[PDB]
Write a protein that binds this DNA or RNA. Structure first.
Ligand SMILES: Nc1ncnc2c1ncn2[C@@H]1O[C@H](COP(=O)(O)OP(=O)(O)OP(O)(O)=S)[C@@H](O)[C@H]1O
Ligand SMILES: Nc1ncnc2c1ncn2[C@@H]1O[C@H](COP(=O)(O)OP(=O)(O)OP(O)(O)=S)[C@@H](O)[C@H]1O
Ligand SMILES: [Mg+2]
Ligand SMILES: [Mg+2]
Lengths: 494, 452, 192
DNA sequence: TACAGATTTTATGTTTAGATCTTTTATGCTTGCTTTTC
DNA sequence: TTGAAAAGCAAGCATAAAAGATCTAAACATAAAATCTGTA
């Protein structure tokens, strides 16, 4: 045969066809009704879940103990009635209902900051629309959800949509022409409205505006019945991508989701804990199992001051809801740990949570752990930091040479040769305590402390093979290093 | 424990540490081990002797210098592991995995796990030693490859009957200090003294030297030599000692350079001997004093045309002289319009500018000076005595440039026709001096004035 | 002695794995129980281990150089001290070397003055042992792509002839003065 | 009148040729002063 | 001698230019699944 110049022995290719849709049913007048086909619109395909489920199952439960705080922790996750988001719900629902009722196409753009709750309210709107359609008030439709961060290649959207509307399996380009023909030329008497939910839109338009332009433009055609809802972080993202005139031609609806306040967040937290708060529980003393209404009758309380202070702190900085929920959950977890530790329980009066637990859980996310890290470092590393600070206090250049640091360390050692500690540390620092080792040039354990400081994210060193003129710089500002040095004793004194 | 320590000449502590670290029990042995030492320090010799002293230990030898990348290294590992495991146990049925399928570090782990699964019918856990002898000699090396081979020992199965352990042999210290935080056990091989080098050199190239045919021919052409073996060994040892004492200050503590000089200077020293001084080392030393002073480790200088010969000199003058003083050196004609020449330099430079990098000039100045210094061309109204720049001058200049004797501002696909291009010289003073002396030109007079 | 070594590790390294690696050969080397007891009583093996661990650093190579290499190194350091940015090359170093040798000979057996072609080998040997580095050269790149990019470009340092490459020093003259013993005959020349 | 054959479509790996930006050193203008010619 | 002129020297300075880091796109190259094309 032939001699290959290189080989690819780990190539895997999926079985997908190439011929687009506008070659199948011949003339346009020969297209049958697509509503009644058993493969179109997912009419009969409801067995994909059973293909891979029942694999992660096992048969054993050794009477898992459920402490009192377990219920509170379980009922406070980010998965388990919208209290604040009502205007956006009304606007989106009205737009979508008007679009569905009159058999038209439309585009809704939602922009916001993380944790506001845009996906939740969009899904709630979709559920309400599905219920209304099942009530036989508007023509039935299909709901397709497409995410942006859950795809390997960015151009995998097209085929997915096609695979959710036809049952075929084509490549991305052929899917693009198939979708174009389907949305343009198929008559409106043989289709069904589709509600796409393009999500994390900013992750698709990163090399070109092709996907966004196509998806937004497919709503312009008269024969199409598409209703696109796209959510994103930045508000004026399409303008920065497509252009003013194209956007003006398209004419979509725009909605902005502002952050939360310290009242709405507290309302959310209080709503998520209604039945549990101020209730009664039967608790077994031997094990610790708790049952909602020998054994004891106890109560669970959560101080409103703790909720208020947590909401006030969280809403001040970001406006999230996930972080507030997680803070409350962590406070409950700390209280549960203390309770089990005190009562000597294990895995398999009025118990409350005070403001102290919430404050302790809140301080863990704001404080930094650099000062504590340096107040426990070795003597040589602290000497290195001290020499660097001294050189910076003279040159004021923020980027020092390494040989200068070595010379400064040597001068500092040789000029204070009258203090007891540095008098008796010199031999262990230069000859490691033995009389058979010649006097070293740099220090004992130079590279070790250098790499220990450089790995932790405290120093920055440029790459040069000459190890005497390499430049290093700090990365934690200067006041923190000054505090860390001042907390010492032998370095403070000299 | 249960291992045997071999006897190496001047590597006692290294041998003790090696016997302390590696053994046949996977429970007590380190997953990684580094041996460090510069060129010609005696590490592969010690390791090979140690493995030859203990035949129970299994080992696979690689040399990541023939392999010049990481993908070939992975494939070589995946192939040699299979080959060694097949040749050792022949009664275990097994399939074959193509080494060329290994293209990524993860695929190497998958293939190694698949290979190690089959040999699960063995009695007790063993250990297989993989010696990457020369890890620092990879041609395209970066500071990330080692971080993968360090952690490769955690993704493999933990309860398999075949355990793999790595052993590296590293040259430099700057590379090794990069990974000093990992705290991997190390054994360092310091360089040799002079006495140790002399003794090692004698012990190595003493026996082999005497069975050479040259000395046999020289003694069959000569008379009898009683006490043949002892006298021959003494002669060899004396020659080795003489060559060491002569060229230690030039070869350093390098075994290879001395081992090459000994072979270089043997065929003549054996010719210089004779019967009347075969038993007199001193007189023999006097009779062969010539080959102990000059090392001689080397293998018109150029064959250029006349105009190229002067063109190189003109380029050198252009590059290593300052333009402001040009007019004072070459103006040699009368004037009709009133004018004055240049006064010239007032003080001499004290740096001898020929010790520094050459400067840049222009083509026009080069042509002008070439015309100025070119020898005169061999009813004078139509003489045209001065040489003019015709086609062949430019052709020879291009020939000079393409031979790397003239450089320019180096960038890909130069365009010779642009004002932003300048030239310079790439020959040392010796070559230009030889060229000048080969055409009867006194170049030194131009440079003696500034500094001899 | 064990407490003293522990305290030294605490004040210098502060890491258990280093001490563990130090202790392993101490207990794996002894052959008899009495030997183990006396080794743990005296801890004389840890000194040998520490001495070896420092046997290839910057000051461990300087004590394994011949006379000519030491003289060339001293001359190069002297030349590099006077320069503005510390750069030098072969010709200046050899000129300083020959001046120093002539001064030594005239002051006073005569010391042989090796020729240029014999000093070339010593220069290459010194640049191999990582005593000089090129003018402005990076070492090993951080990742593979950077090395691949750099391997396709011809640096200007490999086109200039041998005599004009600009090197830089890694040991300053003061360190030579500190390290070299006072009995050496080149000691007086280690300061300007 | 298929089907083993040749051809096309979608999908990544391997090496060469050229472009833009950042850091550091060399080149030329200016201003004031003074030796050299003549 | 004669200083007026040209030539020479030096300090302070701005600004072009060299050397290399970081990246992109064309040319060169291999491969599995689907379509196309002569004839049983
Ligand atoms: N009005 C609300 N009522 C109850 N829970 C809410 C409300 N708003 C937000 N949440 C919480 O917010 C959690 C996160 O979901 P979302 O806020 O919809 O996420 P998101 O807005 O898509 O965030 P991204 O993806 O980072 S922009 C939900 O699981 C809810 O617990
Ligand atoms: N301790 C020793 N005893 C006897 N002969 C030795 C000793 N050390 C080295 N030699 C000899 O000198 C040679 C030097 O080569 P090696 O020791 O193998 O070099 P090396 O250290 O492997 O060099 P690199 O690192 O691979 S360039 C050996 O092959 C022996 O012939
Ligand atoms: Mg979301
Ligand atoms: Mg070797």
């Amino acid at each position: 045969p032939v001699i290959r110049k290189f080989t690819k022995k780990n190539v895997a290719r999926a079985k997908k066809k190439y011929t687009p849709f506008s070659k199948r049913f011949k003339s346009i007048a020969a297209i049958p009704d697509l509503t009644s086909l058993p493969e179109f619109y997912g009419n009969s395909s409801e067995l994909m879940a059973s293909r891979f489920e029942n694999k992660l199952k096992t048969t054993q439960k050794h009477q898992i103990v459920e402490t009192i705080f377990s219920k509170v922790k379980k009922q406070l996750n980010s998965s388990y009635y919208l209290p604040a988001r009502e205007n956006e719900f009304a606007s989106i629902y009205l737009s979508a209902y008007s679009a569905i009722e009159s058999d038209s196409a439309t585009t809704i753009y939602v922009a916001g900051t993380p944790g506001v709750g845009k996906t939740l309210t969009v899904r709630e709107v979709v559920k309400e629309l599905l219920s209304s359609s099942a009530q036989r008030e508007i023509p039935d439709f299909l709901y397709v959800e497409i995410n942006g961060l859950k795809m390997v290649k960015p151009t995998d959207c097209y085929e997915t949509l096609w695979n959710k509307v036809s049952g075929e399996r084509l490549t991305w380009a052929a899917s693009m022409e198939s979708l174009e023909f389907y949305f343009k030329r198929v008559p409106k008497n043989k289709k069904k409205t589709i509600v796409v939910l393009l999500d994390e839109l900013d992750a698709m338009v990163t090399k070109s505006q092709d996907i966004m332009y196509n998806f937004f433009n497919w709503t312009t055609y008269e024969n199409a019945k598409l209703i696109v809802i796209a959510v994103a972080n930045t508000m004026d993202l399409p303008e920065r991508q497509l252009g003013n005139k194209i956007t003006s031609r398209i004419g979509f609806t725009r909605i902005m989701f502002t952050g939360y306040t310290h009242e709405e967040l507290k309302n959310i937290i209080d709503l998520r804990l209604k039945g549990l708060n101020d209730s009664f529980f039967y608790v077994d003393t031997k094990t610790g199992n708790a049952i909602l209404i020998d054994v004891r009758k106890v109560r669970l309380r959560m101080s409103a001051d703790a909720i208020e202070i947590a909401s006030r702190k969280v809403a001040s900085v970001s406006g999230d809801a996930r972080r507030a929920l997680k803070v409350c959950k962590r406070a409950a977890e700390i209280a549960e740990k203390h309770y089990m530790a005190k009562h000597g329980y294990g895995y398999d009066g009025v118990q409350t949570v005070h403001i102290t637990h919430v404050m302790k859980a809140l301080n863990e996310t704001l404080n930094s752990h650099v000062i504590t890290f340096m107040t426990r470092l070795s003597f040589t590393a602290k000497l290195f930091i001290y020499a660097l600070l001294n050189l910076m206090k003279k040159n004021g250049s923020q980027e020092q040479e390494l040989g200068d640091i070595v010379d400064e360390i040597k001068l500092l050692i040789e000029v204070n040769g009258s203090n007891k500690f540095v008098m008796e540390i010199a031999k262990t620092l230069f000859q490691q305590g033995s009389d058979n080792i010649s006097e070293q040039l740099r220090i004992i354990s130079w590279d070790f402390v250098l790499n220990q400081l450089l790995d932790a994210g405290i120093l920055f060193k440029q790459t040069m093979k000459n190890d005497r003129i390499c430049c290093v710089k700090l990365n934690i500002s200067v006041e923190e290093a000054k505090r860390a040095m001042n907390e010492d004793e032998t370095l403070r004194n000299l | 424990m249960n291992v045997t320590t071999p006897e190496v000449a001047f590597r006692e502590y290294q041998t003790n540490c090696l016997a302390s670290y590696i053994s046949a029990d996977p429970d007590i042995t380190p997953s990684n081990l580094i041996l460090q030492g510069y060129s010609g320090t005696g590490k592969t010799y010690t390791l090979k002797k140690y493995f030859n002293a203990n035949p129970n230990l299994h080992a696979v030898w690689l040399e990541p210098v023939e392999l010049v990348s990481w993908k070939p290294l992975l494939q070589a590992i995946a192939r040699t592991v299979q080959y060694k495991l097949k040749t050792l146990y022949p009664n275990i049925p097994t399939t074959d995995y193509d080494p060329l399928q290994v293209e990524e570090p993860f695929l190497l782990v998958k293939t190694l796990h698949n290979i190690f699964v089959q040999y699960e019918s063995l009695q007790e856990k063993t250990c297989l030693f993989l010696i990457l002898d020369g890890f620092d000699s990879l041609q395209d090396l970066d500071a990330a490859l080692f971080n993968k081979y360090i952690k490769l020992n955690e993704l493999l199965p933990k309860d398999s009957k075949i355990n793999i352990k790595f052993i590296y042999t590293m040259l430099e210290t700057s590379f090794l200090q990069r990974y000093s935080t990992h705290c991997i056990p190390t054994v360092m091989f310091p360089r040799y003294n002079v006495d140790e080098v002399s003794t090692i050199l004698v012990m190595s190239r003493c026996g082999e030297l005497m069975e050479d045919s040259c000395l046999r021919k020289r003694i069959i052409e000569e008379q009898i030599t009683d006490c043949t073996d002892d006298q021959f060994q003494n002669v060899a040892a004396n020659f080795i000692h003489l060559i060491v004492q002569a060229f230690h200050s030039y070869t350093g503590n390098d075994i290879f350079a001395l081992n090459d000089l000994i072979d270089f200077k043997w065929p003549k020293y054996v010719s210089r001997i004779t019967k009347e001084n075969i038993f007199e080392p001193l007189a023999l030393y006097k009779s062969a004093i010539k080959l102990f002073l000059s090392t001689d480790d080397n293998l018109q200088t150029y064959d250029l045309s006349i105009i190229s010969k002067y063109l190189l000199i003109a380029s050198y003058i252009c590059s290593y002289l300052e333009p402001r003083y040009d007019a004072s050196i070459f103006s040699r004609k009368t004037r009709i319009i009133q004018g004055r020449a240049a006064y010239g330099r007032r003080k001499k430079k004290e740096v001898n500018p020929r010790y520094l990098q050459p400067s840049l000039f222009a083509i026009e100045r080069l042509l002008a000076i070439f015309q100025a210094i070119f020898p005169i061309q061999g009813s004078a109204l139509r003489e045209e005595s001065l040489m003019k720049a015709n086609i062949e001058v430019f052709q020879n200049l291009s020939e000079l440039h393409t031979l790397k004797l003239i450089a320019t501002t180096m960038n890909k696909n130069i365009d010779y026709l642009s004002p932003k291009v300048r030239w310079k010289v790439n020959v040392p003073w010796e070559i230009i001096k030889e060229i000048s002396e080969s055409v009867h030109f006194n170049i030194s007079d131009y440079f003696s004035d500034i500094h001899e | 002695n064990l407490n003293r070594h522990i305290r030294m590790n605490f004040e210098t390294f502060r890491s258990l794995p280093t001490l563990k690696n130090s202790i392993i050969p101490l207990v794996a080397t002894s052959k008899n129980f009495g030997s183990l007891c006396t080794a743990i009583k005296s801890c004389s093996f840890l000194d040998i281990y520490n001495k070896n661990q420092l046997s290839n650093n910057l000051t461990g190579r300087l004590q394994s150089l011949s006379d000519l290499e030491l003289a060339i190194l001293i001359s190069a350091a002297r030349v590099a001290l006077r320069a503005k940015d510390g750069s030098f090359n072969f010709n200046l170093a050899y000129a300083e070397y020959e001046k120093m040798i002539k001064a030594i000979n005239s002051r006073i057996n005569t010391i042989k003055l090796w020729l240029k072609k014999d000093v070339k080998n010593v220069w290459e040997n010194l640049v191999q042992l990582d005593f000089f580095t090129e003018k402005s050269a990076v070492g090993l790149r951080d990742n593979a792509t950077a090395a691949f990019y750099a391997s396709n470009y011809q640096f200007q340092g490999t086109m200039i002839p041998f005599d004009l490459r600009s090197y830089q020093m890694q040991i300053i003259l003061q360190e030579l003065r500190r390290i070299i013993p006072k009995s050496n005959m080149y000691y007086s020349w280690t300061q300007l």
